[PDB]
mmCIF file of all heavy atoms in Angstrom:
data_model
loop_
_atom_site.group_PDB
_atom_site.id
_atom_site.type_symbol
_atom_site.label_atom_id
_atom_site.label_comp_id
_atom_site.label_asym_id
_atom_site.label_seq_id
_atom_site.Cartn_x
_atom_site.Cartn_y
_atom_site.Cartn_z
ATOM 1 N N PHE A 3 228.088 32.831 -15.137
ATOM 2 C CA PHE A 3 227.183 33.927 -15.385
ATOM 3 C C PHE A 3 227.896 35.211 -15.751
ATOM 4 O O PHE A 3 227.245 36.237 -16.046
ATOM 5 C CB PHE A 3 226.281 34.211 -14.170
ATOM 6 C CG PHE A 3 225.108 33.279 -14.052
ATOM 7 C CD1 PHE A 3 224.295 33.310 -12.944
ATOM 8 C CD2 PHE A 3 224.831 32.356 -15.042
ATOM 9 C CE1 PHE A 3 223.221 32.484 -12.834
ATOM 10 C CE2 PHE A 3 223.762 31.506 -14.925
ATOM 11 C CZ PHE A 3 222.961 31.565 -13.829
ATOM 12 N N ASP A 4 229.247 35.206 -15.783
ATOM 13 C CA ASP A 4 229.986 36.427 -16.032
ATOM 14 C C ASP A 4 229.882 36.824 -17.510
ATOM 15 O O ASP A 4 229.630 37.992 -17.845
ATOM 16 C CB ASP A 4 231.465 36.221 -15.633
ATOM 17 C CG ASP A 4 232.063 35.015 -16.255
ATOM 18 O OD1 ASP A 4 232.265 34.981 -17.485
ATOM 19 O OD2 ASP A 4 232.372 34.040 -15.519
ATOM 20 N N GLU A 5 230.064 35.890 -18.453
ATOM 21 C CA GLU A 5 230.105 36.180 -19.879
ATOM 22 C C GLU A 5 228.709 36.453 -20.424
ATOM 23 O O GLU A 5 228.584 37.091 -21.487
ATOM 24 C CB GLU A 5 230.747 35.010 -20.635
ATOM 25 C CG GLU A 5 229.785 33.925 -21.066
ATOM 26 C CD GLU A 5 229.251 33.141 -19.882
ATOM 27 O OE1 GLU A 5 229.826 33.265 -18.796
ATOM 28 O OE2 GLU A 5 228.236 32.423 -20.074
ATOM 29 N N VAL A 6 227.637 36.015 -19.734
ATOM 30 C CA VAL A 6 226.308 36.344 -20.176
ATOM 31 C C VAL A 6 225.833 37.710 -19.650
ATOM 32 O O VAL A 6 224.918 38.305 -20.190
ATOM 33 C CB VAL A 6 225.306 35.252 -19.735
ATOM 34 C CG1 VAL A 6 225.075 35.295 -18.240
ATOM 35 C CG2 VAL A 6 223.998 35.364 -20.511
ATOM 36 N N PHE A 7 226.508 38.234 -18.626
ATOM 37 C CA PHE A 7 226.223 39.576 -18.118
ATOM 38 C C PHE A 7 227.296 40.594 -18.453
ATOM 39 O O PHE A 7 226.963 41.704 -18.863
ATOM 40 C CB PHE A 7 226.046 39.521 -16.579
ATOM 41 C CG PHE A 7 224.650 39.179 -16.176
ATOM 42 C CD1 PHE A 7 223.862 38.328 -16.927
ATOM 43 C CD2 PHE A 7 224.124 39.718 -14.997
ATOM 44 C CE1 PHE A 7 222.579 38.035 -16.525
ATOM 45 C CE2 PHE A 7 222.828 39.392 -14.627
ATOM 46 C CZ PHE A 7 222.054 38.573 -15.379
ATOM 47 N N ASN A 8 228.585 40.256 -18.302
ATOM 48 C CA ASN A 8 229.638 41.139 -18.710
ATOM 49 C C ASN A 8 229.966 40.923 -20.173
ATOM 50 O O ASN A 8 231.075 40.570 -20.543
ATOM 51 C CB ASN A 8 230.887 40.942 -17.864
ATOM 52 C CG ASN A 8 230.698 41.250 -16.389
ATOM 53 O OD1 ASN A 8 229.928 42.153 -16.049
ATOM 54 N ND2 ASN A 8 231.358 40.520 -15.538
ATOM 55 N N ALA A 9 228.986 41.104 -21.048
ATOM 56 C CA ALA A 9 229.118 40.885 -22.477
ATOM 57 C C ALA A 9 229.235 42.208 -23.212
ATOM 58 O O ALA A 9 228.435 43.118 -23.003
ATOM 59 C CB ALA A 9 227.929 40.079 -23.011
ATOM 60 N N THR A 10 230.227 42.293 -24.089
ATOM 61 C CA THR A 10 230.456 43.504 -24.850
ATOM 62 C C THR A 10 229.341 43.785 -25.860
ATOM 63 O O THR A 10 228.833 44.883 -25.965
ATOM 64 C CB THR A 10 231.793 43.440 -25.578
ATOM 65 O OG1 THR A 10 231.904 42.183 -26.245
ATOM 66 C CG2 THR A 10 232.958 43.577 -24.598
ATOM 67 N N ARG A 11 228.903 42.731 -26.565
ATOM 68 C CA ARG A 11 227.891 42.859 -27.590
ATOM 69 C C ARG A 11 226.677 42.013 -27.227
ATOM 70 O O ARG A 11 226.809 40.846 -26.838
ATOM 71 C CB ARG A 11 228.438 42.439 -28.959
ATOM 72 C CG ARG A 11 227.500 42.691 -30.130
ATOM 73 C CD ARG A 11 228.098 42.221 -31.438
ATOM 74 N NE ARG A 11 229.280 43.019 -31.808
ATOM 75 C CZ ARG A 11 230.508 42.537 -31.795
ATOM 76 N NH1 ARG A 11 230.771 41.273 -31.465
ATOM 77 N NH2 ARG A 11 231.510 43.325 -32.155
ATOM 78 N N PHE A 12 225.500 42.608 -27.307
ATOM 79 C CA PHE A 12 224.252 41.926 -27.002
ATOM 80 C C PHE A 12 223.453 41.690 -28.275
ATOM 81 O O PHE A 12 223.849 42.028 -29.384
ATOM 82 C CB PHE A 12 223.450 42.694 -25.975
ATOM 83 C CG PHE A 12 224.126 42.738 -24.622
ATOM 84 C CD1 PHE A 12 224.856 43.850 -24.250
ATOM 85 C CD2 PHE A 12 224.032 41.683 -23.741
ATOM 86 C CE1 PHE A 12 225.492 43.902 -23.031
ATOM 87 C CE2 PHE A 12 224.655 41.710 -22.522
ATOM 88 C CZ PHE A 12 225.383 42.838 -22.147
ATOM 89 N N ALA A 13 222.266 41.103 -28.102
ATOM 90 C CA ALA A 13 221.448 40.649 -29.221
ATOM 91 C C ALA A 13 220.186 41.493 -29.331
ATOM 92 O O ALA A 13 219.710 42.088 -28.363
ATOM 93 C CB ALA A 13 221.062 39.184 -29.075
ATOM 94 N N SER A 14 219.665 41.558 -30.553
ATOM 95 C CA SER A 14 218.486 42.362 -30.840
ATOM 96 C C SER A 14 217.250 41.698 -30.211
ATOM 97 O O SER A 14 217.258 40.544 -29.787
ATOM 98 C CB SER A 14 218.281 42.517 -32.355
ATOM 99 O OG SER A 14 217.711 41.342 -32.896
ATOM 100 N N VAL A 15 216.176 42.500 -30.140
ATOM 101 C CA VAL A 15 214.926 41.998 -29.514
ATOM 102 C C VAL A 15 214.315 40.874 -30.327
ATOM 103 O O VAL A 15 213.750 39.939 -29.786
ATOM 104 C CB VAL A 15 213.952 43.171 -29.301
ATOM 105 C CG1 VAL A 15 213.472 43.727 -30.617
ATOM 106 C CG2 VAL A 15 212.768 42.697 -28.459
ATOM 107 N N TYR A 16 214.435 40.936 -31.662
ATOM 108 C CA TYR A 16 213.904 39.873 -32.492
ATOM 109 C C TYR A 16 214.853 38.681 -32.567
ATOM 110 O O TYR A 16 214.433 37.602 -33.006
ATOM 111 C CB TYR A 16 213.586 40.383 -33.917
ATOM 112 C CG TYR A 16 214.766 40.932 -34.653
ATOM 113 C CD1 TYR A 16 215.599 40.115 -35.425
ATOM 114 C CD2 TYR A 16 215.081 42.285 -34.599
ATOM 115 C CE1 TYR A 16 216.661 40.624 -36.094
ATOM 116 C CE2 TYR A 16 216.185 42.795 -35.288
ATOM 117 C CZ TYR A 16 216.964 41.979 -36.042
ATOM 118 O OH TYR A 16 218.046 42.488 -36.692
ATOM 119 N N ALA A 17 216.122 38.849 -32.159
ATOM 120 C CA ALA A 17 217.106 37.794 -32.128
ATOM 121 C C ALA A 17 217.628 37.607 -30.715
ATOM 122 O O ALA A 17 218.832 37.491 -30.476
ATOM 123 C CB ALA A 17 218.258 38.078 -33.094
ATOM 124 N N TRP A 18 216.702 37.569 -29.769
ATOM 125 C CA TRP A 18 217.060 37.495 -28.351
ATOM 126 C C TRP A 18 217.944 36.276 -28.056
ATOM 127 O O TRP A 18 217.622 35.145 -28.446
ATOM 128 C CB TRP A 18 215.784 37.447 -27.496
ATOM 129 C CG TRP A 18 214.732 36.480 -27.989
ATOM 130 C CD1 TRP A 18 213.978 36.593 -29.119
ATOM 131 C CD2 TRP A 18 214.305 35.278 -27.347
ATOM 132 N NE1 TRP A 18 213.108 35.536 -29.244
ATOM 133 C CE2 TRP A 18 213.315 34.697 -28.168
ATOM 134 C CE3 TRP A 18 214.653 34.609 -26.179
ATOM 135 C CZ2 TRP A 18 212.655 33.513 -27.847
ATOM 136 C CZ3 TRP A 18 214.037 33.431 -25.863
ATOM 137 C CH2 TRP A 18 213.033 32.895 -26.686
ATOM 138 N N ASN A 19 219.035 36.524 -27.346
ATOM 139 C CA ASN A 19 220.100 35.544 -27.203
ATOM 140 C C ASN A 19 219.728 34.474 -26.170
ATOM 141 O O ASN A 19 219.250 34.773 -25.086
ATOM 142 C CB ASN A 19 221.405 36.200 -26.775
ATOM 143 C CG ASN A 19 222.616 35.306 -26.956
ATOM 144 O OD1 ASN A 19 222.544 34.285 -27.627
ATOM 145 N ND2 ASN A 19 223.734 35.684 -26.382
ATOM 146 N N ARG A 20 219.912 33.217 -26.578
ATOM 147 C CA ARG A 20 219.563 32.050 -25.796
ATOM 148 C C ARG A 20 220.811 31.434 -25.130
ATOM 149 O O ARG A 20 221.888 31.438 -25.734
ATOM 150 C CB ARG A 20 218.902 30.956 -26.677
ATOM 151 C CG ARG A 20 217.424 31.069 -26.897
ATOM 152 C CD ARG A 20 216.589 31.241 -25.612
ATOM 153 N NE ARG A 20 217.230 30.614 -24.437
ATOM 154 C CZ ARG A 20 217.149 29.323 -24.155
ATOM 155 N NH1 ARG A 20 216.498 28.484 -24.945
ATOM 156 N NH2 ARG A 20 217.735 28.879 -23.081
ATOM 157 N N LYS A 21 220.622 30.936 -23.925
ATOM 158 C CA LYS A 21 221.668 30.178 -23.220
ATOM 159 C C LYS A 21 221.002 29.092 -22.380
ATOM 160 O O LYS A 21 219.891 29.304 -21.837
ATOM 161 C CB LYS A 21 222.525 31.078 -22.318
ATOM 162 C CG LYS A 21 223.404 32.088 -23.065
ATOM 163 C CD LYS A 21 224.517 31.449 -23.882
ATOM 164 C CE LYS A 21 225.179 30.228 -23.180
ATOM 165 N NZ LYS A 21 225.535 30.507 -21.762
ATOM 166 N N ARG A 22 221.646 27.959 -22.249
ATOM 167 C CA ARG A 22 221.202 26.895 -21.375
ATOM 168 C C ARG A 22 222.291 26.572 -20.371
ATOM 169 O O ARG A 22 223.463 26.487 -20.722
ATOM 170 C CB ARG A 22 220.866 25.621 -22.171
ATOM 171 C CG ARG A 22 219.725 24.816 -21.587
ATOM 172 C CD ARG A 22 219.588 23.482 -22.250
ATOM 173 N NE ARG A 22 220.367 22.450 -21.548
ATOM 174 C CZ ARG A 22 221.467 21.910 -22.029
ATOM 175 N NH1 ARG A 22 221.954 22.229 -23.205
ATOM 176 N NH2 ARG A 22 222.100 20.974 -21.304
ATOM 177 N N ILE A 23 221.907 26.395 -19.088
ATOM 178 C CA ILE A 23 222.818 26.121 -18.020
ATOM 179 C C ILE A 23 222.376 24.838 -17.304
ATOM 180 O O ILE A 23 221.216 24.708 -16.923
ATOM 181 C CB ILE A 23 222.867 27.301 -17.007
ATOM 182 C CG1 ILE A 23 223.310 28.572 -17.725
ATOM 183 C CG2 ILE A 23 223.823 26.990 -15.872
ATOM 184 C CD1 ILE A 23 224.690 28.477 -18.349
ATOM 185 N N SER A 24 223.326 23.902 -17.164
ATOM 186 C CA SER A 24 223.031 22.662 -16.504
ATOM 187 C C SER A 24 224.347 22.086 -15.940
ATOM 188 O O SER A 24 225.434 22.427 -16.425
ATOM 189 C CB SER A 24 222.361 21.627 -17.442
ATOM 190 O OG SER A 24 222.306 20.356 -16.849
ATOM 191 N N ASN A 25 224.221 21.235 -14.924
ATOM 192 C CA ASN A 25 225.336 20.542 -14.291
ATOM 193 C C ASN A 25 226.276 21.602 -13.782
ATOM 194 O O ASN A 25 227.389 21.786 -14.318
ATOM 195 C CB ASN A 25 225.972 19.573 -15.312
ATOM 196 C CG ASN A 25 227.296 18.982 -14.824
ATOM 197 O OD1 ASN A 25 227.825 19.303 -13.747
ATOM 198 N ND2 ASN A 25 227.855 18.079 -15.645
ATOM 199 N N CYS A 26 225.860 22.386 -12.787
ATOM 200 C CA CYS A 26 226.728 23.419 -12.223
ATOM 201 C C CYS A 26 226.209 23.748 -10.810
ATOM 202 O O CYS A 26 225.260 23.169 -10.312
ATOM 203 C CB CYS A 26 226.746 24.659 -13.098
ATOM 204 S SG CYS A 26 225.345 25.786 -12.867
ATOM 205 N N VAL A 27 226.874 24.705 -10.173
ATOM 206 C CA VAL A 27 226.410 25.291 -8.926
ATOM 207 C C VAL A 27 226.185 26.767 -9.176
ATOM 208 O O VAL A 27 227.076 27.481 -9.694
ATOM 209 C CB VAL A 27 227.376 25.065 -7.776
ATOM 210 C CG1 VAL A 27 228.780 25.601 -8.094
ATOM 211 C CG2 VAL A 27 226.852 25.718 -6.513
#
Side-chain angles (χ1 to χ4, degrees):
Chain A
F3 280 174
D4 53 69
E5 88 292 345
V6 72
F7 274 32
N8 298 325
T10 48
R11 187 181 294 110
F12 293 98
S14 79
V15 65
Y16 61 88
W18 46 290
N19 196 14
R20 274 310 330 281
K21 294 292 320 313
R22 214 191 91 251
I23 301 299
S24 171
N25 170 357
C26 82
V27 56

